[PDB]
Design an enzyme around this catalytic site. Structure first.
Site, PDB file in Angstrom:
ATOM      1  N   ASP A  62       0.699  -1.286  -0.052  1.00 55.02           N
ATOM      2  CA  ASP A  62      -0.127  -0.061   0.038  1.00 55.02           C
ATOM      3  C   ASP A  62       0.824   1.374  -0.018  1.00 55.02           C
ATOM      4  OD1 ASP A  62      -1.893   1.894   0.323  1.00 55.02           O
ATOM      5  OD2 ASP A  62      -2.444   1.419   2.460  1.00 55.02           O
ATOM      6  N   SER A 119      -0.760  15.688 -12.298  1.00 51.74           N
ATOM      7  CA  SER A 119      -0.921  15.167 -13.509  1.00 51.74           C
ATOM      8  C   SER A 119      -1.167  16.307 -14.233  1.00 51.74           C
ATOM      9  CB  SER A 119      -2.308  14.050 -13.624  1.00 51.74           C
ATOM     10  OG  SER A 119      -2.576  14.010 -14.812  1.00 51.74           O
TER      11      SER A 119
END
Length: 330
Positions: A35, A199
């Site tokens: 994770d 992004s």
């Protein structure tokens, strides 16, 4: 040193991936959920409330000659999906894919929430976010990657998740055969303890690319892709019959649909998520309503590049003094 381990979807939907981890002497092999959105390595154990164990493999510290109780240490964690666990701490030898760390904090669960009990395939979590998020008290502990780092050939690990198929976590090297073209690297902020990046935009299907900054985290521990409501609305508007259902808890679409791809930007580069990756199947057995793999982050407070996004890429987690993230197509 290096390590290399196969990671395997837990079910037909890729709801999560498990990776075998050796703990203790002799080795006790548990299948953990790696994770990159958390920083605790915790396991089902001999200490876990009996009624809360249902099929998991447990760690028994008393059978490990290298196990040592970390006196006074406790831990307690809550995840974004509302699940939780807590207990005490041992130090022990932990190996992943041939890479060994001695003195790793292994957080032994005394309690786990229903969600963990009900998932017989996940024996614990191995966190790979930054150690500043580690919940152990009163002495915060380091992640497996943090402990391994100095010994690695290169201070990196890579995530290469499969679509309905096995993939690979590598430690300490970049497998140049595992991706196509070039790796595009992008800046990381560790301010929130995550692999947080920005992004450069998105496209829906064969539509034009929208340049826009999307701040989010690269999180192997989250199944879906969570993005701003505007982005998600633009995606699902291209699917006839798709809608946001409060009763279901997100966007659903007709199972008869063909889903469009979703593209996200990494600098000047583009990662394409095939439409099929965004299908998470019927909302209930036999239903003709299917659950979407792209969902709104509104009210999460953070955008999350979860497995839906990451499995479309070869992802480098570069833990150099100034961390970065790299993405390549594959």
């Amino acid at each position: 040193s290096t390590g290399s381990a196969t990671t395997t979807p837990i079910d037909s939907l890729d709801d999560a991936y498990i990776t075998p981890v050796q703990i203790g002497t002799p080795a006790q092999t548990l299948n953990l959920d790696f994770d990159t959105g958390s920083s605790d390595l915790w396991v089902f154990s001999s200490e876990t409330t009996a009624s809360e164990v249902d099929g998991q493999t447990i760690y028994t510290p008393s059978k490990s000659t290298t196990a040592k109780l970390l006196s006074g240490a406790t831990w307690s964690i809550s995840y974004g999906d509302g699940s939780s666990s807590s207990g005490d701490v041992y130090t022990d030898t932990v190996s992943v894919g041939g890479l060994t760390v001695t003195g790793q904090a292994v957080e032994s669960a005394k309690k786990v929430s229903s969600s963990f009990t009900e998932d017989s395939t996940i024996d614990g979590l191995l966190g790979l976010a930054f150690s500043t998020l580690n919940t152990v008290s009163p002495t915060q502990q380091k992640t497996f990657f943090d402990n391994a780092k100095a010994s690695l050939d290169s201070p990196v690990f890579t995530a290469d998740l499969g679509y309905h198929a096995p993939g690979t976590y590598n430690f300490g090297f970049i497998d140049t055969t595992a991706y196509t073209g070039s790796i595009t690297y992008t800046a990381v902020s560790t301010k929130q303890g995550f692999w947080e990046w920005t992004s450069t935009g998105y496209a829906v299907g064969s539509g034009t690319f929208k340049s826009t900054s999307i701040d989010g985290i690269a999180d192997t521990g989250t199944t879906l892709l969570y993005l701003p409501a505007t982005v998600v609305s633009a995606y699902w508007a291209q699917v006839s019959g798709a809608k946001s259902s409060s009763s279901v808890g997100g966007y659903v679409f007709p199972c008869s649909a063909t889903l469009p791809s979703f593209t996200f930007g990494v600098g000047s580069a583009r990662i394409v998520i095939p439409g099929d990756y965004i299908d998470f199947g019927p909302i209930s057995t036999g239903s003709s309503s299917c659950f979407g793999g792209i969902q709104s982050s509104a009210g999460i407070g953070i955008n999350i590049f979860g497995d839906v996004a990451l499995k479309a890429a070869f992802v480098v987690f570069n833990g150099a003094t100034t961390p970065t993230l790299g993405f390549a197509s594959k």
